[PDB]
Symmetry: C3
Subunit: 338 residues, 3 copies
């Protein structure tokens, strides 16, 4: 909601209140079971310094509502985004802070399900999700010459945290996308040195991490069809549920398909398929991290209100070598936003 | 404060900064405690008119404690009080899901009107008496627009297997019925739920299910506010033995609250109250008083945005209480800006 | 940003998104790596009557340099939270978490692009942000002397867990006078130290003491300021070799700041800061802070800025207290509203 536009500065305070419940049998399911209510709050501020130069800054927080008021009140509360930047004319834009990864610009094609989906976009995982300390140069329409040809280059700074799961080293990434008449093809790739703490993990053996992904999309006439393929090297985090041993998969092969139609009255049904297969797992060989079919629909009452149901037909085997949940999960959500 | 109203959507960003200090003897053996109690609140109450009959809404609220340092204890007492979204359709009623006030609190709200303290039986994360996560609530006003002033609600409570028994709950259902005429209000609320296994394993109280019910009377007109609550709980009210360092639920509680207030036209509003919560058949102590005091307080409203208040509690708890409940008085002084 | 102003109430929702990186060794002054953070708060004030006004201000810090795991809340805090009243020329009174009265003096030299104001530690009696302070503030001395401002502040005892964040009952004050672009200030405060504070190995006293003075020229796009102050049993000190925490018995604080504001936007800054601790037990006379500062800020407008802040660190490689001896340079790109 645009609350302020005086004297050349625009501030957009926005938020969502998401009443959400997960339904599953009883721990060994896709998403879990119980209350999943959360709220969001953030601002998108932007100042016109002159007709060519734009200054901007964005922050977004997540307040989980499925916690008590004692001890565990702060569980799951994060800062998803926090960055500030400058955009100049047809040259492009530069921002620094906590932002999406340059590979997520590729993975964004298939991340369009009512609640689940886009399972390959792990947070604090190099270039596929949110990540702290990224300097991003972005260019749209290639210096204002070729409409629809957008690219970005992104440098990633080392984060030596106290856990291997959420740490990273110095690295670089980039994305290229061209769109014409509602079509879209994208290519994104990035690499970084694994931190010394990550190297000591039992799972995954390497000196450098790699993520790349490509995408196809048709977005026109109330029809959305999207496909993503990508591979990771020593990047995707994995955890042996049996031994509670964590690390990184040496190689993953990721496929995502999404099919949605948008009706005029508001209902938007969704079918999707996602499979994430890890290879060369230490003492396991190949094991499926993600594998399911999706059937769900989103009803938009308007721009401000929506409800949905998202049913995951989990395809993971009961004897999965890594302890991955095999049960189905269905989510019921009612979302107010401004 | 309504910050946004356009394209059939209204947003009301609200907040308050409450300068608060507790004065007590010492004060671990007092009613409320002692020292700085400054805190801040923030939230939004959004509402969109989908059509002339259907309305969507949502509300969120957070608490930022101001009596903490910038060290390890930075977020000590930071909570999200409310978080839900819902739909209201003509005279059929309203439905929301999220974290909301419990259906028994709708009865408990009659005497929960002291300048600082009060409403002691409305524990947070305690089934139907207070703020609780994962509640689906249906509300009907004026009984489908037929009987103006006759409101009822039904509420489903999902199981929350949390790490502590104090904050856990199982599947439960509750309801409330109230009637209002010319500023008179009578209400009855009740709810029952299955206790979790971790709750059962705790000492103090043996129960298949927890039960909370309460009744309320109030007069709210001509600058006069009178109110009364009576209620009983079964395996619901959390309790702690200070000597033993053991905790659990009281098998039976009996709760009475009385409030008398006059609103002077120039802003001052004095408050007298009485509160007593007795725990019956406590495992290893039998009958023991949880809360017992008299209240004397006054709030001065400068306007709708600024106010100050003093709240003194005449603690009626004997020093020899079996559970170790505080015996000393507590007085609270507050200066509040809000919007 | 004035978010709301109807029927005599004004609310100002404000915030900042600060992209920030520290460049160092890899034992430095400021550190090394991502320092991105966000700020959010409101400054609401209502005109209750013609002569009396009510107000309240809050502010939080959301760190951006953390992950989304266990360390998500690392560095999240409430800086300010208070409410108060202001009556005509009588003055103002507010209670909550606010600035200490010694910071009003320390504010003269706390004006660098990123660092500086080392003496204004958080939760440190009267010298920085502190919780549970009742402050009476009078401007222009009941409207008699233009530019003569003073304040008195009562600090409540805070039985905080650790001695680093604890304090006892105490009183403080500040007096300032300004004339034709010049300004002089004096602030002092004393408080009863906590018993847990007294048990700590470094520092010994029945009460903590802080005072500071300041003079500055702030006109014609020039800013020169100087602060001198001394503390007794108030400044927290820590030995890295021994992992032992306490309070310096005596400190001597000097801060110098020199800036010029170019009309076109650039605003360079040079500064000098030295904090010497006297007779710390086991080490005697040691310094806590010592450096020269070279920095510039570029203000595109009121809402956007970028800066570079380079610290020449004077602390030697063999410092007895283990204070960092490496240099730190900060690069920041700041949007605010
Ligand atoms: Zn995120
Ligand atoms: Zn609550
Ligand atoms: Zn602070």
């Amino acid at each position: 909601a645009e609350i302020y536009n005086k004297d050349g500065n625009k501030v957009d305070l926005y938020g969502k209140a998401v009443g959400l419940h997960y339904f599953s049998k009883g721990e060994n399911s896709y998403g879990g079971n119980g209350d999943m209510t959360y709220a969001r709050l953030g601002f998108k501020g932007e100042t016109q310094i002159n007709s060519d130069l734009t200054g901007y800054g964005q922050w977004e927080y997540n307040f989980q509502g499925n916690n008590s008021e004692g001890a565990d009140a702060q569980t799951g509360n994060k800062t998803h985004l926090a960055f500030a930047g400058l955009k100049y004319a047809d040259v492009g834009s530069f921002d620094y802070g906590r932002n999406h990864g340059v590979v997520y610009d590729a993975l964004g094609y298939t991340d369009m399900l009512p609640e689940f989906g886009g399972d390959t976009a792990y947070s604090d995982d190099f270039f596929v999700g949110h990540v702290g300390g990224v300097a991003t140069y972005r260019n749209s329409n290639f210096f204002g010459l070729v409409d629809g040809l957008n690219f970005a280059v992104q440098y990633l700074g080392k984060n030596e945290r106290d856990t291997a799961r959420r740490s990273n080293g110095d690295g670089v990434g980039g994305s290229i996308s061209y769109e014409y008449e509602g079509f879209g093809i994208v290519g994104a790739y990035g690499a970084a040195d694994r931190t010394n703490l990550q190297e000591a993990q039992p799972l995954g053996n390497g000196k450098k991490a790699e993520q790349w992904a490509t995408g196809l999309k048709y977005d026109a006439n109330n029809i959305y069809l999207a496909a993503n393929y990508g591979e990771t090297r020593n990047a995707t985090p994995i955890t042996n549920k049996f031994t509670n041993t964590s690390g990184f998969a040496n190689k993953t092969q990721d496929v995502l398909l999404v099919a949605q139609y948008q009706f005029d009255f508001g209902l938007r049904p969704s079918i999707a398929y996602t499979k994430s297969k890890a290879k060369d797992v230490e003492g396991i060989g190949d094991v499926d991290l993600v594998n399911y079919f999706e059937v769900g629909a989103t009803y938009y009452f308007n721009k401000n209100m929506s409800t949905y149901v998202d049913y995951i037909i989990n395809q993971i085997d009961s004897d999965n070598k890594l302890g991955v949940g095999s049960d189905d999960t269905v989510a019921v959500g009612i979302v107010y936003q401004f």
